[PDB]
Amino acid sequence: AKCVSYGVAQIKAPALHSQGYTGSNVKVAVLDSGIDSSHPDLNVAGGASFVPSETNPFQDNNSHGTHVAGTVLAVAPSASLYAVKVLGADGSGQYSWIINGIEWAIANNMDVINMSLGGPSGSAALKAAVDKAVASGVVVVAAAGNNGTSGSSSTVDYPAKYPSVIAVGAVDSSNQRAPWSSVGPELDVMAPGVSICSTLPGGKYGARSGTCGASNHVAGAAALILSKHPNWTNTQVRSSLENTATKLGDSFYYGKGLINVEAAAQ
């Protein structure tokens, strides 16, 4: 049956919707496994594929990008989503493919990049691509990773680990950190990511857990902010989110805490 992320209410997106801000004319790139644009509840304004063997960005063989799409749209119902396919049906993608998707997004004047994905290896190529995006005025959001804790050392994945990216970790409905949510200095903010009910290919819906899911909410929130303030730079959108977050626990585990888009939007 149809369902919506409980995270929408928890980040206070309805307060923006009722004010007339639903993400209209804000372009959001979903760098993922594609987006099933058949889904009766999704709208896709465009896209492109950088997976060599899967050249249709509008057919989601994994289901992950479709789930991202639905969570983003649930937060920002009127946002223009673009399916930048950088992962295969197996949920894996080479850094070089991801970089082409990032470059594509910049060249098509995307306002927001969501990357609900991560890898353990660093890359100067991947760092230069996300930095270039940020220097271009793009708000870049990424899942912190599902690696849990390792004492006092960082478990945040790339690209989320880079300073220029908004690294998003996961909470449940209680604002309690998910046990598997990655941690470290590079963690910026949290958002709902436990059993986030969203869209799946074939007109289906389902609950999934991960920082992947948390990142989706923040990317939607950025679009709402740019909805109300189309004049704000990415610097400014990121500031509001970080400075108006609801403090939860220690910043190594919770960053600045839960995003509050209503507070961010004023």
């Binding site: 993922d32 993608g93 080479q94 890898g119 890359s123």
Partner: peptide, 9 residues
């Protein structure tokens, strides 16, 4: 190629 890594969802 050696330097092209893989990321996952």
């Amino acid at each position: 190629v050696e330097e092209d890594h893989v990321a996952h969802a």
